[PDB]
Curated annotation (Swiss-Prot), chain A:
Record's function text: DNA-dependent RNA polymerase catalyzes the transcription of DNA into RNA using the four ribonucleoside triphosphates as substrates. Specific peripheric component of RNA polymerase III which synthesizes small RNAs, such as 5S rRNA and tRNAs. The RPC25/RPC8-RPC17/RPC9 subcomplex may bind Pol III transcripts emerging from the adjacent exit pore during elongation.
More about this protein: Present with 2930 molecules/cell in log phase SD medium.
The protein's name in its UniProt record: DNA-directed RNA polymerase III subunit RPC9
Taxon lineage: Eukaryota, Fungi, Dikarya, Ascomycota, Saccharomycotina
Subcellular localization: Nucleus
Organism encoding this protein: Saccharomyces cerevisiae (strain ATCC 204508 / S288c) (Baker's yeast)
Superkingdom of source: Eukaryota
Family named by the database record: Belongs to the eukaryotic RPC9 RNA polymerase subunit family.
Quaternary structure, from the entry: Component of the RNA polymerase III (Pol III) complex consisting of 17 subunits. Forms a Pol III subcomplex with RPC25/RPC8. Interacts with BURF1/TDS4.
Swiss-Prot record, chain B:
Gene Ontology molecular function terms on file: DNA binding; DNA-directed RNA polymerase activity
Keywords, sorted A to Z: DNA-directed RNA polymerase, Nucleus, Phosphoprotein, Transcription
Record's miscellaneous remark: Present with 752 molecules/cell in log phase SD medium.
Alphabetical list of Gene3D superfamilies matching this protein: Nucleic acid-binding proteins (2.40.50.140), RNA polymerase Rpb7-like, N-terminal domain (3.30.1490.120)
Compartments (UniProt record): Nucleus
Pfam families given in the database record: RNA_pol_Rbc25, SHS2_Rpb7-N
Name the UniProt record assigns to this protein: DNA-directed RNA polymerase III subunit RPC8
Originating organism: Saccharomyces cerevisiae (strain ATCC 204508 / S288c)
Family: Belongs to the eukaryotic RPB7/RPC8 RNA polymerase subunit family.
Gene that produces this protein: RPC25
Job of this protein: DNA-dependent RNA polymerase catalyzes the transcription of DNA into RNA using the four ribonucleoside triphosphates as substrates. Specific peripheric component of RNA polymerase III which synthesizes small RNAs, such as 5S rRNA and tRNA. The RPC25/RPC8-RPC17/RPC9 subcomplex may bind Pol III transcripts emerging from the adjacent exit pore during elongation.
């Protein structure tokens, strides 16, 4: 494993909020789909993915 | 506060998955190794933003799994030097304040040599006080605005990645103090 460039680009707060939000969809991790429901197993990715979102939306 | 990091690495895809979207499979293996995990001397990796390049899968003579060299980018939590970050006071130790980005990162420490000139600790109330003529209290669980000062890495308490913060300028400190 090699790092080609630690800082390749800034992801704006919004861009993150989006990407992480659209991500929870592909894997069914949204308020809506969570209550209407195996979704993607990954507990850690799902884990932090939610927290980052709950942060930028506050 | 967030960035992307161009990285390269070898992945191992099991025969049990050769029928899956090869690339979606790769991404899985990466999150498997990096999602919410630290990247040595870089920072906290949140997930893969995208894949950039993939080679051909070379098989091993011992197990039907093909190995693949991949170049990708990843969403990394790596506040920059000078940035003004907002978090919650998680603990007031006699030597400083510990901050948190609620579930994101807990290794944010603001030491006494970083607070306002005069700040002292109180083991009775369990908090740090700030004088100016008139006592202001950095209390537990209150949003804190702090400036990031040092980026501390350690090849691997102690944590492989931590950050030092400050509160020495108008506006920094407990948020309820300047809104």
């Amino acid at each position: 494993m090699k790092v080609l460039e630690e800082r390749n680009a800034f992801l704006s707060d919004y861009e993150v909020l989006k990407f992480l939000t659209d991500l929870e969809k592909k894997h069914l991790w949204d308020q809506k789909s969570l209550a209407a429901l195996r979704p993607y197993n990954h507990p850690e990715l799902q884990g932090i993915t939610r927290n980052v979102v709950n942060y930028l939306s506050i | 506060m967030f960035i992307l990091s161009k990285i390269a690495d070898l992945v191992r895809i099991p025969p049990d998955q050769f029928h899956r979207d090869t690339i979606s499979a790769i991404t899985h293996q990466l999150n498997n190794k990096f999602a919410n995990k630290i990247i040595p001397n870089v920072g906290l990796c949140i997930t893969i933003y995208d894949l950039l390049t993939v080679e051909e899968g070379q098989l091993k003579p011992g197990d039907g799994s093909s190995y693949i060299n991949v170049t990708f980018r990843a969403v990394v939590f790596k506040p920059f030097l000078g940035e003004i970050v907002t978090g919650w006071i998680s603990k007031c130790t006699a030597e400083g304040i510990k901050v948190s980005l609620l579930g994101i990162f807990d290794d944010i420490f603001i030491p006494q040599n970083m607070l306002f000139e005069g700040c002292y600790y109180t083991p009775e109330e369990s908090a740090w006080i700030w004088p100016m003529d008139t006592k202001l209290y950095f209390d537990v669980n209150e949003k804190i605005r702090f400036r990031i000062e040092r980026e501390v890495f350690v090849d691997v308490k102690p944590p492989a990645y931590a950050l030092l913060g400050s509160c020495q300028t108008d506006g920094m400190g407990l948020v309820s103090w300047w809104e």
